[PDB]
């Protein structure tokens, strides 16, 4: 039993050591490359303009190779855990092995972040030397894409570890613990990936300082591209984490603990999307302060606006998906953990609305920094219209999620009353009051849709921004009023019940 | 029981209210757009020529959006009925709920027609201002296409309501009532859609007044296009209505009542195709009186002729399809409701032949208005040849339907005699006389095909129109004589039977 | 019983009457077209050059339409027989009905041949007037293609009648009679189709008289195209006839009678391919005597050579397929009908070899008429090489068929000895002598392949024609010697048996 | 029994005779072609330049035809064996028949090699006459491709014979004998095919002597192409031979004998890949000594380097595949034949490493002959980098195979201990020590991957060749040390066991 845990501990220690040695090998090769570049700095314009691009290309190739080595190390660690699980029938050693393997994959993603940071700081030391700016930006984007690929591979290995633990586990007290531990590890991986992407965006922001109008615009374009792919990694980590929590719930893992795990996952990923908003806003600030035009200025500002639009949409989508998972788990849960899950869903949706509002403040700050820098006016108006439309979309989706939570909680109240052997006429009265809840909820949803339609009509027509802000304030008042009324009606249904 | 009916009544009242409020929102936004256009009328030629097109584009976007809101309201009303059906085991409340929901979907399609009328009257107020004519026609066609999409969505929701009523219903007296009520609602929807399309064609007819020869021809082209898509909606409404009547017949719904429902459906849809013929004829009159050419005149006249050809063909197809459904239901029916169904089929085919003849009179009026306005002669001859061919095609198809009705009635007489335990030699004599009926029917069909072939030969060769009219009179005499003879032979078979 | 036969007789009489009336309608319309053309002959060069082509196009449209009417009549007659078969349990009336329906489809294909002859004689009366030659040839090819389509439709209706007779029949004495009657009808249909194609080729041969070098070459090209599609109809009629004979054999139809039916089918289709060879040779004679060149002369001669190559190949393929069917039926047959089937297969292969040799004489006559008219020499050498290769291919295939017949007869002798309860050691000696037969047969086949390879090597190298004729004489001597030896070895095996 | 063996002996003697006669026919036709060419040599420049190419084309057509005849002979011999197997229940005659048929297919491939040699010597006698060089090279490549197609057809016939013997055989002592005999025959076929390809490469090497720089480069290109397709035939022969050995093992064929058969197969195919390396090196020597340039010289040298890269890769792949087969058969084998199989795998991997090192020496000799002849420097550096990468790849793959062998042997030791009914705690200790073996093996594999990654990083960066040679020496030291340590750990596990 414990001897298998010690053998896996030794193998994971050796894999951590080889990962550290591979990072040192990357640093050595990057140092050699930088020394060659510095030696060539003294010894034509075309010579430098060509060799610096070749050197950044082979340096990104070296980073991609070290990412491949680290991913192979991760797969071998997963295979080691697979060996250990087979070699063990006990639960204590199994849980200890999963904890140790999650720690190791955390350290491995940390080494990968250090390798990415080395590649980007070397690209900076190269731009010091006078290399290209479009080529440097492209090499940086390739670095970030290989890093995001490593993040996805680690997420899949974490999902496979969760699946092995589910398959070779017969208890709930421990299986839900493994669920929450795997979820903590996935949030850690996505935080490290978002940190890598934020560092790469800051590097592009320090690159655009010495670039031509068009070259700076291309740099901003592919910096928003790397932010888009980091967002894709965040969404994929969320989906895999939620798959893991669904598997355990399916296997009987504690209900309230899985609810707390999904809440913590939603919180961590909303913080990740917030830090990506922050990175995009810093990039937009630098672009506006260096782009130096009247047309490409507004073009880069509008492109950052599309990135923030996608950030808002992904915030809303992750909030809706976690609210729906909590709704299913509520459907399965209990008399009182169901109300705890409804309260937790309300918490997650309040957090998502707050972060969507912070994203709107970020986009408004970017559009004001584009106004003060004197950009195109049509582009700025279109960006403001797009943010009004996107904020309305987030209000719509979060309201739909809250209504779905209220419906699921009412259905759980009814399921509890039916299980507790109440009267038939009484249960008919409860099911008709729940039908009332659903009718008024559908009506509220379509009323929200109608008011959103009116706002979008005025927006595409080209209304003033102050006007749309007041109209959106009205829509928010209406949606909050309708949620409060629907909650009051559901509570009166519950009171009629008991 | 009744409480669920009242809850659904309240939800449908609120959905009717939100639909009315959405129509008011559309009117408000259209008023704002029209005021902006009028304010710009006073304040370049390019400025106006561009902004008026942008304004018509965003106004049609507003109409498309209000159609989307109304369709979402329809889906939510269907979901409300789904809730109510589940919440009810009683038949009276179920039937009352279906009646109320059909009334609501009638009012919803009415609101959609009002929204379409607003969009078209606004496009007219815009052409008053001097916008484009091709762009105005394209915006009008987009409006009509979104309206036809709403009509199809309502038809599918009606079919889903009929299917829910079929699934949650255990009786024939009431289930056939719901069948005929859903069919009345589908005829109402298709009448409203045809009215929207006729109004849009009249709007295009009032547009072509101030358009260039080619611009007027493009306007006429896409007005016939909107008539084609309204015809497609009529055919789809027929197919869905017939699917609904087949489902109930399958479930045991009264036979003679389903026959009366299919007869009324055929009658209403033939009136719809008649009003579309009328709209196409008015459009052709206006085009000929404004196109002002010798080549594009005949081109627009020939295009209206192709539209009338398609109208004739769809009249014939709907008549054949309803005659075939009545033939199947006859196959299932009875001793005497079978003869009632044969009489009703004769009525439907007489009505279809009368409306095909009225369509031929419409096309002849259009070709005479093209002759008097001095158009191309080859195009007019080709149009007359196409109408002779299409009228012959309708005669062929309606005759095939009548023969199929006679065959089905004879088969029902034989099935009745076999069920009533008659002799074996006697039943053999009856089945051989029915084989006689079928032999002479096949011969009659191929004789009609041969005479039609001779007419088409003379037509493609380029015969005179008076000549083809006399030859078509001869073909009609022959087909009526053969139908009378086949009916007499079948009646003599029935007399030999009893 | 007999009353159903009389009712079908009446329906078929009426369908024959309507077919005759449709032929009269075609003659009337063609007469009207020819009168219009003659009236225009007196009343520009472009006027005539355009209107004559339009008139031939609409005349071929009239022919295609009359073919459609005749095919619909055929389908209705099949449906009448279907009614009659259902209406009858007796065998005598069923057989009489099938005989009458085959007679009717014979008369229908005869009317179709008369219609084709009318269309082609009208195209001739038009070329008298001075129409195009390429357009006239294209209209003639379209006429022949519609006629071949009618021939295929009739073949499929004959196959369907054979299948109905098989399905509704319980005896062998009569079922094999119906098999041989359907086969006679299919041979009649393919003879009529080949006659239509030969008449069309003769019409093209009388057209090329007044055509330009290139126009005459195009006429010859598409005349060989119509011969190719008539060959396709012959092959398809063979395949459908053989499918019919296989079905009956499967159903227990007399074995020796099915063998005689396949022999007669092979004989008739070999005569059909012979008459197509004759038509191609007449076309080549006319082309060579009118093409009047040194390059296009040899081009048309080489194209006729490719047509004759395809004729040889299809002769060989039909012979092989019928020999294989007889081999299967032998496998099923008997002690002595098996030897009768082996003798009949020898007869069919002798007939196929004789007709392949006649095809070679036809191609040699064509190449001599191209030599005497002074054509290109490379093309003539390539044509002679292609005929040597094709004659060698036919020798190979027919020898393979004869060897397959000998193998099947030996296998039947062994099956008979095993069924008749002979000794085990004795049956082992017989099966090893049959293995000897198969070994030496495989060796003979590959020796034939090797000698054919040597001839083809010398041919592609460009050997003299007299030389290849002597080498082919040697290959024929070798194949006949090996067949005689293999037959002697099989007969000695049979003698060792008994 | 024996009589069937004698009948098959007679048929195979006749097929050998016809093959010999076909070779004589090819020689006769080639002699005639060469005489025509010599006669034309005396009797324009364009005349010769065209007719010599036409003559080489038709000569390669003659060779392709003789290959087709020989393949048909092979198929007929397979069919003869199929007859004989059916005709025999005894094992002695069956084995004698398979031995005789393998001898015959050996003689047939020998005749095919003689035909290929005749075609190539005739192409040489033609280049004596002054034909093209690109066309001669293309004709030679077509000859070699048809020869490789014949080699593949023979390999498939050998696999089919092995499958027939497996299907109609009930014993292991004899079935494993047939397995090893079929494997010897497949090694013989692949040796003959490699000899044909080496002769063709030598012919191209004697062709490039009188070719233009670009023409010589094209000749070298397609000579390496024929070497590539001969390598493909070697790999396919290996795969089919291994399929055959797997089938017998599946059927119960002796285990240790199948291991010896796979070892001998691997040895023979490694010798084949060695002789292909030798042919490529001779071709590169001739090219460098005749190409006479500074750019195309290095281009041809780099192309030979890619061919040697593919040779190294295929050596490694065949070694890995045979080691994996021996690992499976070990998994099935025994207590001591398992250690014999581990020793044999060590032998095969030592042989594969030695031949990969010889391939590296060949490529280094080619690059030194390109350095001394003064070629491009970038191309030579890229070739040296490619060989360092390929040698590292072969080290990686062979080490993976050796580790897989050690894992399989440990698993067999554990399976033996579990079968021999040892204690449960004892078996748990053994399975945890085997888990130790697997952990340290995974760590060793990823350490090898990391060091290989560092070498490839330095290589793509453009390190010096002496430097990479020392780094590769270090990687080899590390891999040998890790294999020795893993073997010592496994042996200590086995000692703890017993």
CSV table of C-alpha atoms in Angstrom, one decimal, chain A residues 150-444:
chain,number,residue,atom,x,y,z
A,150,UNK,CA,0.3,22.8,-23.1
A,151,UNK,CA,-2.4,24.2,-20.9
A,152,UNK,CA,-5.0,22.2,-22.8
A,153,UNK,CA,-3.0,19.0,-22.5
A,154,UNK,CA,-2.6,19.5,-18.8
A,155,UNK,CA,-6.4,20.0,-18.5
A,156,UNK,CA,-7.0,16.8,-20.3
A,157,UNK,CA,-4.5,14.9,-18.1
A,158,UNK,CA,-6.3,16.4,-15.0
A,159,UNK,CA,-9.6,15.2,-16.4
A,160,UNK,CA,-8.1,11.7,-17.0
A,161,UNK,CA,-6.9,11.6,-13.4
A,162,UNK,CA,-10.3,12.6,-12.2
A,163,UNK,CA,-11.8,9.8,-14.3
A,164,UNK,CA,-9.3,7.2,-13.0
A,165,UNK,CA,-10.1,8.2,-9.4
A,166,UNK,CA,-13.8,8.0,-10.1
A,167,UNK,CA,-13.4,4.5,-11.7
A,168,UNK,CA,-11.2,3.0,-9.0
A,169,UNK,CA,-13.2,4.6,-6.1
A,170,UNK,CA,-16.1,3.2,-4.1
A,171,UNK,CA,-17.0,6.1,-1.6
A,172,UNK,CA,-18.6,9.5,-1.5
A,173,UNK,CA,-16.8,11.2,1.4
A,174,UNK,CA,-13.5,10.7,-0.5
A,175,UNK,CA,-14.7,10.9,-4.0
A,176,UNK,CA,-16.1,14.4,-3.6
A,177,UNK,CA,-12.9,15.4,-2.0
A,178,UNK,CA,-11.0,14.2,-5.1
A,179,UNK,CA,-13.5,16.1,-7.2
A,180,UNK,CA,-12.9,19.4,-5.4
A,181,UNK,CA,-9.1,18.8,-5.5
A,182,UNK,CA,-9.1,18.2,-9.3
A,183,UNK,CA,-11.2,21.3,-9.7
A,184,UNK,CA,-8.7,23.4,-7.6
A,185,UNK,CA,-6.0,22.0,-9.9
A,186,UNK,CA,-7.9,23.0,-13.0
A,187,UNK,CA,-8.4,26.5,-11.7
A,188,UNK,CA,-4.7,26.7,-10.9
A,189,UNK,CA,-3.8,25.6,-14.5
A,190,UNK,CA,-6.1,28.1,-16.0
A,191,UNK,CA,-4.8,30.9,-13.8
A,192,UNK,CA,-1.2,30.0,-14.9
A,193,UNK,CA,-2.3,30.0,-18.5
A,194,UNK,CA,-4.0,33.4,-18.1
A,195,UNK,CA,-0.9,34.7,-16.4
A,196,UNK,CA,1.2,33.6,-19.4
A,197,UNK,CA,-1.2,35.3,-21.8
A,198,UNK,CA,-1.2,38.5,-19.7
A,199,UNK,CA,2.6,38.5,-19.7
A,200,UNK,CA,2.6,38.0,-23.4
A,201,UNK,CA,0.2,40.9,-23.9
A,202,UNK,CA,2.4,43.1,-21.7
A,203,UNK,CA,5.3,42.1,-23.9
A,204,UNK,CA,3.5,43.1,-27.0
A,205,UNK,CA,2.5,46.4,-25.3
A,206,UNK,CA,6.2,47.1,-24.7
A,207,UNK,CA,6.9,46.1,-28.3
A,208,UNK,CA,4.5,48.5,-30.0
A,209,UNK,CA,6.6,51.4,-28.7
A,210,UNK,CA,9.0,51.2,-31.7
A,211,UNK,CA,6.7,50.1,-34.5
A,212,UNK,CA,5.2,51.7,-37.6
A,213,UNK,CA,1.5,52.7,-37.5
A,214,UNK,CA,0.6,49.5,-39.5
A,215,UNK,CA,3.1,47.4,-37.7
A,216,UNK,CA,1.7,48.6,-34.3
A,217,UNK,CA,-1.8,47.7,-35.5
A,218,UNK,CA,-0.7,44.2,-36.5
A,219,UNK,CA,1.0,43.8,-33.1
A,220,UNK,CA,-2.3,44.8,-31.4
A,221,UNK,CA,-4.2,42.5,-33.7
A,222,UNK,CA,-2.3,39.4,-32.8
A,223,UNK,CA,-2.1,40.4,-29.1
A,224,UNK,CA,-5.8,40.3,-29.1
A,225,UNK,CA,-5.6,37.0,-30.9
A,226,UNK,CA,-3.5,35.5,-28.1
A,227,UNK,CA,-6.0,36.9,-25.6
A,228,UNK,CA,-8.7,35.2,-27.6
A,229,UNK,CA,-6.9,31.8,-27.5
A,230,UNK,CA,-6.3,32.2,-23.8
A,231,UNK,CA,-10.0,32.8,-23.4
A,232,UNK,CA,-10.6,29.6,-25.3
A,233,UNK,CA,-8.3,27.8,-22.9
A,234,UNK,CA,-10.3,29.3,-20.0
A,235,UNK,CA,-13.6,28.1,-21.5
A,236,UNK,CA,-12.2,24.6,-22.2
A,237,UNK,CA,-10.8,24.3,-18.7
A,238,UNK,CA,-14.3,25.2,-17.4
A,239,UNK,CA,-16.0,22.6,-19.6
A,240,UNK,CA,-13.5,19.9,-18.6
A,241,UNK,CA,-13.8,20.8,-14.9
A,242,UNK,CA,-17.6,20.7,-15.2
A,243,UNK,CA,-17.4,17.3,-16.9
A,244,UNK,CA,-15.4,16.1,-14.0
A,245,UNK,CA,-17.9,17.4,-11.4
A,246,UNK,CA,-20.8,15.9,-13.4
A,247,UNK,CA,-19.0,12.5,-13.4
A,248,UNK,CA,-18.7,12.4,-9.6
A,249,UNK,CA,-22.2,13.6,-9.1
A,250,UNK,CA,-23.2,10.7,-11.4
A,251,UNK,CA,-21.1,8.3,-9.2
A,252,UNK,CA,-22.7,9.6,-6.0
A,253,UNK,CA,-20.2,12.2,-4.9
A,254,UNK,CA,-21.5,14.4,-2.1
A,255,UNK,CA,-24.0,16.9,-3.5
A,256,UNK,CA,-23.3,20.1,-1.5
A,257,UNK,CA,-19.6,19.6,-1.9
A,258,UNK,CA,-19.9,19.4,-5.7
A,259,UNK,CA,-22.0,22.6,-5.5
A,260,UNK,CA,-19.2,24.3,-3.6
A,261,UNK,CA,-16.7,23.1,-6.1
A,262,UNK,CA,-18.6,24.5,-9.0
A,263,UNK,CA,-19.0,27.8,-7.2
A,264,UNK,CA,-15.3,28.0,-6.5
A,265,UNK,CA,-14.6,27.1,-10.1
A,266,UNK,CA,-16.9,29.8,-11.4
A,267,UNK,CA,-15.3,32.3,-9.1
A,268,UNK,CA,-11.8,31.5,-10.1
A,269,UNK,CA,-12.6,31.5,-13.8
A,270,UNK,CA,-14.4,34.8,-13.5
A,271,UNK,CA,-11.3,36.2,-11.9
A,272,UNK,CA,-9.3,34.8,-14.9
A,273,UNK,CA,-11.6,36.6,-17.3
A,274,UNK,CA,-11.2,39.7,-15.2
A,275,UNK,CA,-7.5,39.6,-15.5
A,276,UNK,CA,-7.8,39.1,-19.2
A,277,UNK,CA,-10.0,42.2,-19.4
A,278,UNK,CA,-7.2,44.0,-17.5
A,279,UNK,CA,-4.6,42.8,-20.0
A,280,UNK,CA,-6.7,43.9,-23.0
A,281,UNK,CA,-7.3,47.3,-21.4
A,282,UNK,CA,-3.5,47.8,-20.8
A,283,UNK,CA,-2.9,46.8,-24.4
A,284,UNK,CA,-5.5,49.3,-25.7
A,285,UNK,CA,-4.0,52.1,-23.6
A,286,UNK,CA,-0.5,51.5,-25.0
A,287,UNK,CA,-1.8,51.2,-28.5
A,288,UNK,CA,-3.8,54.4,-28.3
A,289,UNK,CA,-0.8,56.2,-26.8
A,290,UNK,CA,1.5,54.9,-29.6
A,291,UNK,CA,-0.6,54.2,-32.7
A,292,UNK,CA,-0.6,58.0,-33.6
A,293,UNK,CA,-3.3,58.2,-36.2
A,294,UNK,CA,-7.0,59.1,-36.7
A,295,UNK,CA,-8.0,55.9,-38.5
A,296,UNK,CA,-5.8,53.1,-37.3
A,297,UNK,CA,-6.3,54.5,-33.8
A,298,UNK,CA,-10.0,53.9,-34.0
A,299,UNK,CA,-9.4,50.6,-35.7
A,300,UNK,CA,-7.2,49.2,-32.9
A,301,UNK,CA,-9.7,50.6,-30.4
A,302,UNK,CA,-12.5,48.9,-32.1
A,303,UNK,CA,-10.5,45.6,-32.2
A,304,UNK,CA,-9.9,45.8,-28.5
A,305,UNK,CA,-13.7,46.5,-28.2
A,306,UNK,CA,-14.4,43.2,-30.0
A,307,UNK,CA,-12.0,41.4,-27.7
A,308,UNK,CA,-13.9,42.9,-24.7
A,309,UNK,CA,-17.2,41.9,-26.3
A,310,UNK,CA,-15.9,38.3,-26.5
A,311,UNK,CA,-14.7,38.5,-22.9
A,312,UNK,CA,-18.2,39.6,-21.7
A,313,UNK,CA,-19.8,36.9,-23.7
A,314,UNK,CA,-17.5,34.2,-22.3
A,315,UNK,CA,-18.1,35.5,-18.8
A,316,UNK,CA,-21.8,35.2,-19.4
A,317,UNK,CA,-21.5,31.7,-20.9
A,318,UNK,CA,-19.4,30.3,-18.1
A,319,UNK,CA,-21.8,31.8,-15.5
A,320,UNK,CA,-24.8,30.2,-17.3
A,321,UNK,CA,-23.2,26.8,-17.6
A,322,UNK,CA,-22.2,26.7,-14.0
A,323,UNK,CA,-25.7,27.8,-13.0
A,324,UNK,CA,-27.2,25.1,-15.1
A,325,UNK,CA,-24.9,22.4,-13.5
A,326,UNK,CA,-25.9,23.6,-10.1
A,327,UNK,CA,-29.5,23.4,-11.2
A,328,UNK,CA,-29.2,19.8,-12.2
A,329,UNK,CA,-27.4,18.9,-8.9
A,330,UNK,CA,-30.1,20.8,-7.1
A,331,UNK,CA,-32.7,18.6,-9.0
A,332,UNK,CA,-30.9,15.7,-7.4
A,333,UNK,CA,-30.0,17.1,-4.0
A,334,UNK,CA,-32.3,17.4,-0.9
A,335,UNK,CA,-34.7,19.5,1.1
A,336,UNK,CA,-32.2,22.1,2.4
A,337,UNK,CA,-29.0,21.7,0.3
A,338,UNK,CA,-31.3,22.7,-2.5
A,339,UNK,CA,-31.9,26.1,-0.9
A,340,UNK,CA,-28.2,26.3,-0.2
A,341,UNK,CA,-27.6,25.6,-4.0
A,342,UNK,CA,-30.1,28.3,-4.9
A,343,UNK,CA,-28.3,30.8,-2.7
A,344,UNK,CA,-25.0,29.8,-4.2
A,345,UNK,CA,-26.4,30.3,-7.7
A,346,UNK,CA,-27.6,33.7,-6.7
A,347,UNK,CA,-24.1,34.4,-5.5
A,348,UNK,CA,-22.5,33.2,-8.8
A,349,UNK,CA,-24.9,35.3,-10.9
A,350,UNK,CA,-24.3,38.4,-8.7
A,351,UNK,CA,-20.5,37.9,-9.2
A,352,UNK,CA,-21.0,37.4,-12.9
A,353,UNK,CA,-23.1,40.6,-13.2
A,354,UNK,CA,-20.5,42.5,-11.2
A,355,UNK,CA,-17.7,41.3,-13.5
A,356,UNK,CA,-19.7,42.1,-16.6
A,357,UNK,CA,-20.2,45.6,-15.3
A,358,UNK,CA,-16.5,45.9,-14.6
A,359,UNK,CA,-15.9,44.8,-18.2
A,360,UNK,CA,-18.2,47.5,-19.4
A,361,UNK,CA,-16.3,50.1,-17.3
A,362,UNK,CA,-13.1,48.8,-19.0
A,363,UNK,CA,-14.6,49.2,-22.4
A,364,UNK,CA,-15.9,52.7,-21.6
A,365,UNK,CA,-12.4,53.6,-20.3
A,366,UNK,CA,-10.9,52.4,-23.6
A,367,UNK,CA,-13.4,54.3,-25.7
A,368,UNK,CA,-12.7,57.5,-23.6
A,369,UNK,CA,-9.0,57.1,-24.2
A,370,UNK,CA,-9.8,56.7,-27.9
A,371,UNK,CA,-12.0,59.9,-27.8
A,372,UNK,CA,-9.3,61.9,-26.1
A,373,UNK,CA,-6.6,60.7,-28.5
A,374,UNK,CA,-8.8,61.9,-31.4
A,375,UNK,CA,-9.9,58.8,-33.4
A,376,UNK,CA,-12.5,58.1,-36.0
A,377,UNK,CA,-16.0,58.9,-34.8
A,378,UNK,CA,-18.0,56.3,-36.7
A,379,UNK,CA,-15.8,53.5,-35.3
A,380,UNK,CA,-16.2,54.9,-31.8
A,381,UNK,CA,-19.9,55.1,-32.2
A,382,UNK,CA,-20.0,51.5,-33.5
A,383,UNK,CA,-17.9,50.3,-30.5
A,384,UNK,CA,-20.3,52.0,-28.0
A,385,UNK,CA,-23.2,50.4,-29.8
A,386,UNK,CA,-21.5,47.0,-29.6
A,387,UNK,CA,-21.0,47.4,-25.9
A,388,UNK,CA,-24.6,48.4,-25.3
A,389,UNK,CA,-25.7,45.4,-27.2
A,390,UNK,CA,-23.2,43.1,-25.4
A,391,UNK,CA,-24.2,44.4,-21.9
A,392,UNK,CA,-27.8,43.8,-22.8
A,393,UNK,CA,-26.9,40.3,-23.9
A,394,UNK,CA,-25.2,39.6,-20.6
A,395,UNK,CA,-28.2,40.9,-18.7
A,396,UNK,CA,-30.4,38.6,-20.8
A,397,UNK,CA,-28.3,35.5,-20.3
A,398,UNK,CA,-27.8,36.0,-16.5
A,399,UNK,CA,-31.5,36.6,-16.0
A,400,UNK,CA,-32.3,33.4,-17.9
A,401,UNK,CA,-29.9,31.6,-15.6
A,402,UNK,CA,-31.5,33.0,-12.5
A,403,UNK,CA,-34.9,32.1,-13.7
A,404,UNK,CA,-33.7,28.6,-14.5
A,405,UNK,CA,-32.4,28.4,-10.9
A,406,UNK,CA,-35.8,29.5,-9.5
A,407,UNK,CA,-37.6,26.9,-11.7
A,408,UNK,CA,-35.2,24.1,-10.6
A,409,UNK,CA,-35.7,25.0,-6.9
A,410,UNK,CA,-39.4,25.0,-7.3
A,411,UNK,CA,-39.3,21.6,-9.0
A,412,UNK,CA,-37.2,20.3,-6.1
A,413,UNK,CA,-39.7,21.6,-3.6
A,414,UNK,CA,-42.4,19.8,-5.5
A,415,UNK,CA,-40.3,16.6,-5.8
A,416,UNK,CA,-39.7,16.7,-2.0
A,417,UNK,CA,-43.4,17.1,-1.3
A,418,UNK,CA,-44.3,14.2,-3.6
A,419,UNK,CA,-41.6,12.0,-2.0
A,420,UNK,CA,-42.8,12.9,1.5
A,421,UNK,CA,-46.2,11.4,0.7
A,422,UNK,CA,-48.5,14.5,0.8
A,423,UNK,CA,-52.1,14.6,-0.4
A,424,UNK,CA,-53.1,14.4,-4.0
A,425,UNK,CA,-55.2,17.5,-4.2
A,426,UNK,CA,-52.5,19.3,-2.2
A,427,UNK,CA,-49.9,18.2,-4.7
A,428,UNK,CA,-52.1,19.3,-7.5
A,429,UNK,CA,-52.4,22.7,-6.0
A,430,UNK,CA,-48.6,22.9,-5.6
A,431,UNK,CA,-48.0,21.7,-9.2
A,432,UNK,CA,-50.5,24.3,-10.5
A,433,UNK,CA,-48.7,27.1,-8.5
A,434,UNK,CA,-45.5,25.9,-10.0
A,435,UNK,CA,-47.1,26.1,-13.4
A,436,UNK,CA,-47.9,29.7,-12.5
A,437,UNK,CA,-44.3,30.3,-11.6
A,438,UNK,CA,-43.3,28.9,-15.0
A,439,UNK,CA,-45.9,30.9,-16.9
A,440,UNK,CA,-44.9,34.2,-15.3
A,441,UNK,CA,-41.2,33.3,-15.8
A,442,UNK,CA,-41.8,32.8,-19.6
A,443,UNK,CA,-43.6,36.0,-19.7
A,444,UNK,CA,-40.8,37.8,-17.9
